[PDB]
UniProtKB/Swiss-Prot annotation:
Shown stretch of the complete protein: 106 to 384 of 384
Catalytic activity: Hydrolysis of keratin, and of other proteins with subtilisin-like specificity. Hydrolyzes peptide amides
Transmembrane helix listed as a keyword: no
GO molecular function terms noted in the UniProt entry: metal ion binding; serine-type endopeptidase activity
Disulfide linkage: C34-C123, C178-C249
Record bears the keyword rRNA-binding: no
Family: Belongs to the peptidase S8 family.
Protein name: Proteinase K
One GO location term (cellular component): extracellular region
Cofactor: record remark: Binds 2 calcium ions per subunit.
Organism, scientific name: Parengyodontium album
Domain Peptidase S8: residue ranges: 7-279
Length: 279
């Protein structure tokens, strides 16, 4: 399949080089997979989700996304126009309030929720979780992410937006999950992107168009935006078979565009998420 005039990040994920604008992908499009977006929620009624999104959990007085961040991330995973895996099922877990804040205890509860909740969902091709959030190093937060991964969920987490070594942030610093840095449309490391040995992969993160609340769209930037490209890619690859939750981060790294990004600090992987789709 070919989507013309796609957001640059989608085109990038299916290209051996930067500067094209058509997204190419296998028509299966993540059908039969599921992605949990653990964030401020998802506006499930957005036409871009086509009934494939739903809220499954909140820790606040509402499950509504009153921020937009979660809706944007979900859009990059699986919206019809702005998404990587255009046929995946999207499950919203609201661990962040409408200001985008959340206590680590609530975030941990959300991760353990997903590890159990997947047993209440139909995801024959596999389960992914996208965590576009983080804070300072916490062994408890890292351990929760590790449990989620161990339970059979492909966990993708944002590296963070501090232009610093991600070793000092959680869940970014958890070795067993897939830690995602951000790049721009000219294949530069995004200026805010964290880096370091704990990173596994980079994805498009600067000026990313996606869904927003009130049935709208907007372009924003962050490792928060890179993460759902990788989460969607994992879901897509899992329905193709290609890989599994336990192996998807390694597979994505194995098949990535290599050595193409600029301003990657010595010691950080130079790997850009790539679907290796041959039309
Ligand atoms: Ca990691």
């Amino acid at each position: 399949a070919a989507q013309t005039n796609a957001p640059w990040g989608l085109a990038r994920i299916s290209s051996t080089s930067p500067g094209t604008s058509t997204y190419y992908y296998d028509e299966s499009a993540g059908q039969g997979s599921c992605v949990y977006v653990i964030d401020t929620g998802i506006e499930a009624s957005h036409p871009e989700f086509e009934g494939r999104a739903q809220m499954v959990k909140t820790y606040y007085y509402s499950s509504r996304d009153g921020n937009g961040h979660g809706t944007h991330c979900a859009g990059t995973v699986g919206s019809r126009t702005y998404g990587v895996a255009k046929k995946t099922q999207l499950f919203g877990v609201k661990v962040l309030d409408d200001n985008g804040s959340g206590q680590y205890s609530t975030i941990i509860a959300g991760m353990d929720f997903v590890a159990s909740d997947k047993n209440n969902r139909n995801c024959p091709k596999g389960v992914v979780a996208s965590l576009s959030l983080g804070g300072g190093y916490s062994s408890s937060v890292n351990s929760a992410a590790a449990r989620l991964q161990s339970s059979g969920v492909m966990v993708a987490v944002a590296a963070g937006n501090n232009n610093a070594d991600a070793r000092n942030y959680s869940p970014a610093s958890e070795p067993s999950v897939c830690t995602v840095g951000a790049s721009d449309r000219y294949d530069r490391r995004s200026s805010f992107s964290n880096y370091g040995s704990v990173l596994d992969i980079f994805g498009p993160g600067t000026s990313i168009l996606s869904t927003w609340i009130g049935g709208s769209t907007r372009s924003i930037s962050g490792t928060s935006m890179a993460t759902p490209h990788v989460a969607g890619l994992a879901a897509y690859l899992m329905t193709l078979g290609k890989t599994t939750a336990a192996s998807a981060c390694r597979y994505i790294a194995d098949t990535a565009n290599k050595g193409d990004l600029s301003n990657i600090p010595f010691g950080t992987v130079n790997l850009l998420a790539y679907n290796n789709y041959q039309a």
